[PDB]
């Protein structure tokens, strides 16, 4: 029975009208020590999905290899596979849902919180959760780990329910994920300034933006705090 | 010579094995079927044969899954096995990958299934020919499975006894049934013609015809008895 040794914390995601955003800090925290820098959570799979993986970096690597063999699996025995039996986010999710459970049943849990975000080739927004209790649910907005408690309410203003999707656009959604990051940077210890942010659209395709920096920086209110409660 | 036909682990000087050609013959010894298809529907029409007229036929269509199904030609003991495994692969895809299994890949696992007993001593190449029809993402398909394991994507083919006359009906009219779409009845009309040329010393009955159809919005359905009396 594995325990987390090194862990990623927080992937945030949301739905918008023509596709989805998935984003996460880049960090492999070895507990209290911020051990590893430049660790990349977001792995493109096929070209219409990004799967983000938080939790044990040790389990992550293993999941990365399984994901790469799923792409390779689709090529094998197919005359083509870029629109014939092209790899959808949903197929990937189902392949993962089964293995996390199977492993849970053998009592060696893949210790992860996973969000699969993508778009289908049917025009359908896909965004769904799986984790190491093998629990699954579909929801319009998702977040894992610390970020569930913290950042997910904030996105829930932007989209509460599934009839405010057509009234939210790509510039606005992008804006909301970055303000969500700012907040994870401030108020979470295993969150770095470094972050990656991927936009999968069914029209624009994959945009993977790497090494963005938190901005809109508030620290200039800090000189007016003097003492702990009573101190002149 | 033919002292070499008693083992399937022995080759001939003419670069054959004898057991595999003999397994080919075994198809012919059984009933007759004609497959043909259109871009938005796939159809098998198969002759049911009975032992005597108190005997009430043999079911020649085995429904695989709700997007695939197949007909048999040759020995029945053999067919029940091959069918079972194939159904198992369609249910595996539906559970673990949330997919309707492609006709092309499914046919290809069967080719691999055939070679497992060909190589190993004991067991035999199977003595039944299968025509698999299905409707996936890449639309309608008709595959011709062979004892050898040669799998052939075709617009129309026929196997069994005196099946060369169906291929002559299908060859003349090849381009005509490709152009039919949206009308299942008319693919059935073409099939009914086809299986007429195959017969010798017989005439079609409401219980000789067994007509099997899968298409775009129609799942796999097997018509029998009083559902084949609109096209008798």
Curated annotation (Swiss-Prot), chain A:
<dbReference type="GO" id="GO:0005634">
    <property type="term" value="C:nucleus"/>
</dbReference>
<dbReference type="InterPro" id="IPR023333">
    <property type="entry name" value="Proteasome_suB-type"/>
</dbReference>
<protein>
    <recommendedName>
        <fullName>Proteasome subunit beta type-7</fullName>
    </recommendedName>
</protein>
<comment type="similarity">
    <text>Belongs to the peptidase T1B family.</text>
</comment>
<dbReference type="InterPro" id="IPR001353">
    <property type="entry name" value="Proteasome_sua/b"/>
</dbReference>
<keyword id="KW-0647">Proteasome</keyword>
<comment type="function">
    <text>Non-catalytic component of the proteasome which degrades poly-ubiquitinated proteins in the cytoplasm and in the nucleus. It is essential for the regulated turnover of proteins and for the removal of misfolded proteins. The proteasome is a multicatalytic proteinase complex that is characterized by its ability to cleave peptides with Arg, Phe, Tyr, Leu, and Glu adjacent to the leaving group at neutral or slightly basic pH. It has an ATP-dependent proteolytic activity. PRE3 and PRE4 are necessary for the peptidyl-glutamyl-peptide-hydrolyzing activity.</text>
</comment>
<dbReference type="GO" id="GO:0010499">
    <property type="term" value="P:proteasomal ubiquitin-independent protein catabolic process"/>
</dbReference>
<keyword id="KW-0539">Nucleus</keyword>
<dbReference type="GO" id="GO:0000502">
    <property type="term" value="C:proteasome complex"/>
</dbReference>
<dbReference type="GO" id="GO:0034515">
    <property type="term" value="C:proteasome storage granule"/>
</dbReference>
<dbReference type="GO" id="GO:0005829">
    <property type="term" value="C:cytosol"/>
</dbReference>
<keyword id="KW-0963">Cytoplasm</keyword>
<dbReference type="GO" id="GO:0043248">
    <property type="term" value="P:proteasome assembly"/>
</dbReference>
<dbReference type="InterPro" id="IPR016295">
    <property type="entry name" value="Proteasome_beta4"/>
</dbReference>
<dbReference type="InterPro" id="IPR016050">
    <property type="entry name" value="Proteasome_bsu_CS"/>
</dbReference>
<dbReference type="Pfam" id="PF00227">
    <property type="entry name" value="Proteasome"/>
</dbReference>
<dbReference type="InterPro" id="IPR029055">
    <property type="entry name" value="Ntn_hydrolases_N"/>
</dbReference>
<dbReference type="GO" id="GO:0019774">
    <property type="term" value="C:proteasome core complex, beta-subunit complex"/>
</dbReference>
<comment type="subunit">
    <text>The 26S proteasome consists of a 20S proteasome core and two 19S regulatory subunits. The 20S proteasome core is composed of 28 subunits that are arranged in four stacked rings, resulting in a barrel-shaped structure. The two end rings are each formed by seven alpha subunits, and the two central rings are each formed by seven beta subunits. The catalytic chamber with the active sites is on the inside of the barrel. Interacts with CIC1.</text>
</comment>
<dbReference type="GO" id="GO:0043161">
    <property type="term" value="P:proteasome-mediated ubiquitin-dependent protein catabolic process"/>
</dbReference>
Swiss-Prot record, chain B:
<dbReference type="Pfam" id="PF00227">
    <property type="entry name" value="Proteasome"/>
</dbReference>
<keyword id="KW-0832">Ubl conjugation</keyword>
<dbReference type="InterPro" id="IPR001353">
    <property type="entry name" value="Proteasome_sua/b"/>
</dbReference>
<dbReference type="InterPro" id="IPR050115">
    <property type="entry name" value="Proteasome_alpha"/>
</dbReference>
<dbReference type="GO" id="GO:0005634">
    <property type="term" value="C:nucleus"/>
</dbReference>
<dbReference type="Pfam" id="PF10584">
    <property type="entry name" value="Proteasome_A_N"/>
</dbReference>
<dbReference type="GO" id="GO:0019773">
    <property type="term" value="C:proteasome core complex, alpha-subunit complex"/>
</dbReference>
<dbReference type="GO" id="GO:0000502">
    <property type="term" value="C:proteasome complex"/>
</dbReference>
<feature type="modified residue" description="Phosphoserine">
    <location>
        <position position="12"/>
    </location>
</feature>
<feature type="cross-link" description="Glycyl lysine isopeptide (Lys-Gly) (interchain with G-Cter in ubiquitin)">
    <location>
        <position position="189"/>
    </location>
</feature>
<dbReference type="GO" id="GO:0010499">
    <property type="term" value="P:proteasomal ubiquitin-independent protein catabolic process"/>
</dbReference>
<dbReference type="GO" id="GO:0034515">
    <property type="term" value="C:proteasome storage granule"/>
</dbReference>
<dbReference type="InterPro" id="IPR029055">
    <property type="entry name" value="Ntn_hydrolases_N"/>
</dbReference>
<dbReference type="GO" id="GO:0043161">
    <property type="term" value="P:proteasome-mediated ubiquitin-dependent protein catabolic process"/>
</dbReference>
<keyword id="KW-0597">Phosphoprotein</keyword>
<comment type="similarity">
    <text>Belongs to the peptidase T1A family.</text>
</comment>
<comment type="subunit">
    <text>The 26S proteasome consists of a 20S proteasome core and two 19S regulatory subunits. The 20S proteasome core is composed of 28 subunits that are arranged in four stacked rings, resulting in a barrel-shaped structure. The two end rings are each formed by seven alpha subunits, and the two central rings are each formed by seven beta subunits. The catalytic chamber with the active sites is on the inside of the barrel.</text>
</comment>
<comment type="function">
    <text>The proteasome degrades poly-ubiquitinated proteins in the cytoplasm and in the nucleus. It is essential for the regulated turnover of proteins and for the removal of misfolded proteins. The proteasome is a multicatalytic proteinase complex that is characterized by its ability to cleave peptides with Arg, Phe, Tyr, Leu, and Glu adjacent to the leaving group at neutral or slightly basic pH. It has an ATP-dependent proteolytic activity.</text>
</comment>
<dbReference type="InterPro" id="IPR000426">
    <property type="entry name" value="Proteasome_asu_N"/>
</dbReference>
<protein>
    <recommendedName>
        <fullName>Proteasome subunit alpha type-6</fullName>
    </recommendedName>
</protein>
<keyword id="KW-0647">Proteasome</keyword>
<keyword id="KW-0963">Cytoplasm</keyword>
């Amino acid at each position: 029975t594995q325990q987390p040794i090194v862990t990623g914390t927080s992937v945030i995601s949301m739905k918008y009208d023509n596709g989805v955003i998935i984003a996460a800090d880049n960090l492999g925290s070895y507990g209290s020590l911020l051990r590893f820098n430049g660790v990349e959570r977001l792995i493109p799979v096929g070209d219409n999905t990004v799967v983000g993986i938080s939790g044990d970096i040790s389990d992550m690597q293993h999941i990365e290899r399984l994901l790469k063999d799923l792409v390779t699996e689709n090529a094998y025995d197919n005359p083509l596979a870029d629109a014939e039996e092209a790899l959808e986010p949903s197929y990937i999710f189902e392949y993962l849902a089964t293995v996390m459970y199977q492993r849970r049943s053998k009592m060696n849990p893949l210790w992860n919180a996973i969000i699969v975000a993508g778009v289908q080739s049917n025009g359908d927004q896909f965004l769904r959760y799986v984790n190491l209790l093998g629990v699954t649910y579909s929801s319009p907005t998702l977040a894992t780990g610390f970020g569930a408690h913290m950042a997910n309410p904030l996105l829930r203003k932007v989209v509460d329910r599934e009839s405010d999707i057509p009234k939210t656009t790509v510039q606005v959604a992008e804006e909301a994920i970055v303000n969500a990051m700012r907040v994870l940077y401030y108020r979470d210890a295993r969150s770095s300034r470094n972050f990656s942010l991927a936009i999968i659209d069914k029209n624009t395709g994959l945009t993977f933006k790497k090494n963005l920096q938190v901005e809109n920086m508030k620290w200039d209110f800090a000189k007016d705090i003097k003492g702990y409660g009573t101190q002149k | 010579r033919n002292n070499y036909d008693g083992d399937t682990v022995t080759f001939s000087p003419t670069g054959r094995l004898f057991q595999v050609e003999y397994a080919l013959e075994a198809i012919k010894q059984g009933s007759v079927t004609v497959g043909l298809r259109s871009n938005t529907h796939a159809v098998l029409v198969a002759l049911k044969r009975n032992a005597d007229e108190l005997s009430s036929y043999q079911k020649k269509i085995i429904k695989c899954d709700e997007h695939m199904g197949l007909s048999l030609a040759g020995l029945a003991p053999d067919a029940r096995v091959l069918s079972n495994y194939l159904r198992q692969q369609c249910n595996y895809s539906s559970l673990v990958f949330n997919r309707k299994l492609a006709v092309e890949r499914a046919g290809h696992l069967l080719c691999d299934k055939a070679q497992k007993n060909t190589q190993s001593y004991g067991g035999r190449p199977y003595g039944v020919g299968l025509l698999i029809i299905g409707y996936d993402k890449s639309g309608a398909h008709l595959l011709e499975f062979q004892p050898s394991g040669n799998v052939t994507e075709l617009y129309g083919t026929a196997i069994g006894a005196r099946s060369q006359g169906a291929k002559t009906y299908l060859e003349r009219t090849l381009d005509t049934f490709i152009k039919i779409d949206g009308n299942p009845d008319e693919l059935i009309k073409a099939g009914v013609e086809a299986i007429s040329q195959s017969l010798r010393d017989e005439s079609l009955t409401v219980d000789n015809l067994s007509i099997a159809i899968v298409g775009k919005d129609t799942p796999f359905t097997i018509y029998d008895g009083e559902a084949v009396a609109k096209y008798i």
